[PDB]
From a paper:
The MHC-I molecule plays a crucial role in antiviral immunity by presenting antigenic peptides to activate specific CD8+ T cells to clear virus-infected cells, while its downregulation can activate NK cells and trigger inflammatory responses. Bats possess distinctive characteristic in their MHC-I molecule, with prevalent 3- or 5-amino acid (3AA or 5AA) insertions at the N-terminal end of the peptide binding groove (PBG), which may generate a unique antiviral immune response. To explore the influence of the 5AA insertion on the structure and function of bat MHC-I, we focused on Mylu-B*67:01. Mylu-B*67:01 contains the most common 5AA insertion sequence, MQQPW, and also exhibits the D61/R67 pairing.
Among these three peptides, P1-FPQSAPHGV exhibited highest refolding efficiency and ultimately successfully formed crystals in complex with Mylu-B*67:01 (pMylu-B*67:01-P1). The crystal structures of the pMylu-B*67:01-P1 complex achieves a resolution of 2.2 Å. The crystal structure of pMylu-B*67:01-P1 unveils the intriguing consequences of the MQQPW insertion, forming an additional delicate helix nestled between the 310 Helix and α1 helix of HC. The inserted MQQPW resides at the junction of the 310 Helix and the emerging helix, creating a dainty loop connecting these two helical structures. The MQQPW insertion maintains a considerable distance from the peptide and does not engage in direct interactions. The presence of the R67 side chain induces the closure of the A pocket, thereby obstructing the exposure of the P1-F side chain. Notably, despite the close proximity of D61 and R67, no salt bridge was formed between them. The MQQPW insertion is precisely located within the 310 helix region, which is the most unstable part of the α-helix structure of the MHC-I molecule. In Mylu-B*67:01, there are a total of 12 intra-chain hydrogen bonds in this region to maintain the structure, whereas in Mylu-B*67:01ΔMQQPW, there are only four hydrogen bonds. The conformation of W52 changes significantly during peptide exchange, suggesting that improving the stability of W52 contributes to the stabilization of the complex. Within the helix formed by the MQQPW insertion, the inserted W58 forms a hydrogen bond with W52 on the 310 helix, which helps to strengthen the link between the two smaller helices.
Author numbering:
A (entry chain C): 1 to 9
B (entry chain A): 1 to 280
C (entry chain B): 1 to 98
Write the structure that this text describes.
């Protein structure tokens, strides 16, 4: 089950 | 034994050719189970193992794919921003293609608790930023990634990864290992044979084959009269058969007549005991 | 500084002239991810399937390219790979012993 970073680099 | 859940995010810019493309794949151990591609017409998370195509999925979460879809579209959007900002950090032209990769997931102990989390990034194939095993500080690889570290540390981003790992990550890995038991835990041994390939008067190649084994992990070695020849044997990388098993071989050139002095050794978690075998 | 792909061309099962099999071209350890991988019969492009792009601990990519085939004494099979790391396309002959 996946996850995306809260903020951009 | 020690299992892993890993997602692999790749985004690639294509100056002129249009918007960046984003690809994701999920693996449990050596077994792929999902994929995502921002270039597919109506792009969704897609099962890519049989045991992801089965009613248990609906039953545990009926929104499984819609949610995974949502998250991949997010990751895809964020990476389009990452590719712009990384150009800036590195003071790069708009002209060249660049690549952002992310690899993240968790390992489980035989305890079956979280052993270890990963969350790491590469830019153009080189180490950029990784979450440390404290799960609170980042290792920046260079002075661009240091900006990212200062930013992420100040905003406490690490915390949102922590709770995904301690919450969802372990949780779903156990679900997968349970429901995918016949594929993921049920470990096929290598079927091993030796083949004999003349080259000249001086050398016959003895090639030890290991076929149809899962997982990929294996040790394949020749010994002459109990003495390892690893420094003087040819050993290809483990390669997929295409059916979810792996292949490997190890070859040694021996004098003709000497064939019964060589024993091939095969060790794999799927063998009751290590295989030893010889020519014919 | 691109990384040069490694190439293995091999069948799913041991080759028997006449028996339908699966021809595989595994190409791994490359960067960047843009790559041309074809399977060739007598030097002509076959219809293939490609795995979903993935990568290893060291960030190098790997793909598997495969199709149905039937080995025969008359026919040559090869894998053609072109990548930014290569001066020009490399071809690797299918040998049943490989």
């Amino acid at each position: 089950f996946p996850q995306s970073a809260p903020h951009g680099v | 034994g020690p299992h892993s859940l890993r997602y692999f995010y790749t985004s690639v810019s294509r100056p002129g050719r249009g918007e960046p493309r984003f690809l994701a794949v999920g693996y449990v151990d050596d077994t792929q189970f999902v994929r995502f591609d921002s270039d597919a017409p109506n792009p969704k998370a897609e099962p890519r193992a049989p045991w992801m195509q089965q009613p248990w999925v609906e039953q545990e979460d009926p929104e499984y794919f819609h949610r995974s879809t949502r998250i991949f579209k997010g990751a895809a959007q964020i990476d389009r921003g990452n590719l712009q900002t990384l150009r800036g950090y590195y003071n790069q032209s708009e002209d060249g293609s660049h690549t952002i990769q992310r690899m993240f997931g968790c390992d489980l102990g035989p305890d079956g608790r979280l052993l270890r989390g990963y969350n790491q990034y590469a830019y153009d194939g080189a180490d950029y930023i990784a979450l440390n095993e404290d799960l609170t500080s980042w290792t920046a690889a260079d002075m661009a990634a240091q900006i990212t570290k200062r930013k992420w540390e100040a905003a406490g981003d690490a915390e949102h990864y922590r709770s995904y790992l301690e919450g969802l990550c372990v949780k779903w890995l156990q679900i997968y290992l349970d429901k995918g038991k016949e594929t993921l835990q049920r470990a096929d041994p290598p079927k091993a044979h030796v083949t004999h390939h003349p080259v000249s008067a001086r050398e016959v190649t003895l090639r030890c084959w290991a076929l149809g084994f899962y997982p990929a992990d294996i040790s394949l070695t020749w010994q002459r009269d109990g003495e390892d020849q690893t420094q003087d044997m040819e050993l290809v990388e483990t390669r997929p058969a295409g059916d979810g098993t792996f292949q490997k071989w190890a070859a040694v050139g021996v004098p003709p007549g000497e064939e019964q002095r060589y024993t091939c050794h095969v060790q794999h978690e799927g063998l009751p005991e290590p295989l030893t075998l010889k020519w014919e | 500084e691109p990384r040069t792909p490694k190439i293995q061309v091999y069948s799913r099962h041991p080759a028997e002239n006449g028996k339908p099999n699966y021809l595989n071209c595994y190409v791994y350890g490359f960067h960047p991810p843009q790559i041309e991988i074809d399977l060739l019969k007598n030097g002509q492009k076959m219809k293939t399937e490609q795995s979903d792009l993935s990568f290893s601990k060291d960030w190098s990519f790997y793909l598997l390219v495969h199709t149905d085939f039937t080995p025969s004494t008359v026919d040559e099979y090869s894998c053609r790979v072109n990548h930014s790391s290569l001066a020009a396309p490399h071809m690797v002959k299918w040998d049943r012993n490989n």
